[PDB]
Amino acid sequence: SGAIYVGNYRVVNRHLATHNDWANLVWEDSSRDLLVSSTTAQGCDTIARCDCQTGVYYCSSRRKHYPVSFSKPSLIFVEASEYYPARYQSHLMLAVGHSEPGDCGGILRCQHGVVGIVSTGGNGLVGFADVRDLLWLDE
Ligand SMILES: Cc1nc2n(c1CC(=O)N1CCC[C@H](C(N)=O)C1)CCCC2
Numbered sequence: 001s002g003a004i005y006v007g008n009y010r011v012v013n014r015h016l017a018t019h020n021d022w023a024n025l026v027w028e029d030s031s032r033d034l035l036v037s038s039t040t041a042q043g044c045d046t047i048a049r050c051d052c053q054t055g056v057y058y059c060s061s062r063r064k065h066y067p068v069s070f071s072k073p074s075l076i077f078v079e080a081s082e083y084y085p086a087r088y089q090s091h092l093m094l095a096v097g098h099s100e101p102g103d104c105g106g107i108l109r110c111q112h113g114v115v116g117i118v119s120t121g122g123n124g125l126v127g128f129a130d131v132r133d134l135l136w137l138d139e
């Protein structure tokens with residue numbers, strides 16, 4: 001689990017969105033596994049606006065942060081799960097690292113701020129849903 005709180009927005013994995021997130025929907029993309037909802041309290045996280053391919057991600061299944069090198073966001077094939085059929089997920093970034101389904105929501109972060117959240121995993125690879133192209137989160 002996990003979310004990014006910036007301005008009057010809450011950013012979560014779409015497959016983990018709650019009833020309140022759906023009732024206060026701002027935007028969602030099944031293809032990216034992202035959902036954004038509105039909030040009453042103001043959020044203070046900083047979103048990275050950069051091209052950096054190294055960072056650190058939080059892994060709840062190990063209570064540890066791991067430094068990683070990750071690929072640029074792209075279309076990657078993702079096997080079937082109970083939330084989605086086997087499809088291509090866009091704006092996805094891959095690194096060699098540990099993950100479990102309960103690790104989705106864990107933040108990936110560089111020196112410039114929040115890069116994205118854990119979305120996928122398998123075969124010793126962890127995938128992150130990028131959020132750096134969502135310029136409207138800052139306004
Ligand atoms: C984080 C994670 N790590 C692993 N796994 C997962 C979970 C995973 O990839 N899902 C399941 C939830 C929806 C995700 C999606 N964006 O399509 C795909 C699956 C088992 C092997 C290790």
Ligand SMILES: [Zn+2]
Pocket residue numbers: 048049050051052110111112113
């Ligand atoms: Zn950066």
